[PDB]
């Protein structure tokens, strides 16, 4: 296992290509029919920042939940006493790129529970091994992970 380099994306293609997580299908708002296709994640071994205090960060697609749950396990295994942490899941704050996969629940921004930025390269490596369809060392403060639609 080698940590991803700063700004490295795996696989080596645009996020929204067929080879990656594939195309933006559209924004999901709290009204929408599609809102109901979002599972809240209550895995007790995942820290959700939820600074919004709405629980938005827990909402994601089935596929996102699955990869996130797998990564939760490999993070506890990688560092004794550390957990996966989510800063963003589904988003209604418009805090992303114009057509973020966050706006339809197909992306998470992640850290370790200790916010040790030296761990974050290895964290991205784990998110690839967990089966995220696109991993990106997006900033010094987070790894962005996304998934194909259902």
């Amino acid at each position: 296992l080698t940590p991803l380099a700063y700004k490295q994306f795996i696989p080596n293609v645009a996020e929204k290509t067929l080879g990656a997580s594939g195309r933006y299908e559209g924004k999901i708002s709290r009204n929408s029919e599609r809102f109901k296709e979002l599972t809240p994640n209550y895995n007790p071994d995942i820290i959700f920042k939820d600074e919004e205090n709405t629980g938005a960060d827990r909402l994601m697609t089935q596929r996102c939940k699955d990869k996130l749950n797998a990564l939760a396990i490999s993070v506890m295994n990688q560092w004794p006493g550390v957990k996966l942490r989510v800063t963003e899941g589904w988003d209604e704050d418009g805090h992303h790129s114009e057509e973020s996969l966050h706006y339809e629940g197909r992306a998470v921004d992640i850290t370790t529970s200790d916010r040790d930025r030296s761990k974050y390269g290895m964290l991205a490596r784990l998110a690839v091994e967990a089966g995220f369809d696109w991993v990106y060392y997006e900033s010094k403060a987070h790894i962005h992970c996304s998934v194909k639609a259902e």
Partner: antibody
Amino acid sequence: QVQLQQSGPELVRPGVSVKISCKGSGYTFIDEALHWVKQSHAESLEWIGVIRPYSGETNYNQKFKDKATMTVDISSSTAYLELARLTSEDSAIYYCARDWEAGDFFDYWGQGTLVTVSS
Amino acid sequence: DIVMTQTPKFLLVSAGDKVTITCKASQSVSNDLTWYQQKPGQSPKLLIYYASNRYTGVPDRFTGSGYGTDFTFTISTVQAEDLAVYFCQQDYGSPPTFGGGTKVEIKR
């Protein structure tokens, strides 16, 4: 509504220290890092450093290593900047600013504290 | 430390016209480039991050581009209320560093 409320303006002699403050409201204080930014005519904007309230970890611009101390009081949701051994180059507006854990850049700024170093 | 050179230093521009500001870094800062707007008497306001993303509620007229050393900030159709000093800031290297700023003044 997130707000950073800074302490009032300060006149200090060269050689004296001054401690200014920045109180965070409308969010959970330990959720975000706090930064200090100096605005002078001489040097325009310069990053002094960052404190992480959650860990009390600090990182200083080496230019300010000897000049600046950052601390927080988690209880009052207040960050402090202490500037020691001041000269007229320290006269400036000092801001605090918050990141949103997406990189070291800042969506919320205090109104700024004008420090005049003068005899 | 990374030096950000911002040009021009001043622009005078009529409502409806284009503003183009350049920031060049002394070495590559990937896309870790932020643009702020400081209106007279105020604190800086963040408009653009990761070189090209608009912060929430920032209008369409504001755009950024670039990767590496060479970055561009545009106001497609400057309005009266856009008078301000614009600054870039890199956070690729430690410490973060800012450009010396561009003052935009309205010709009427």
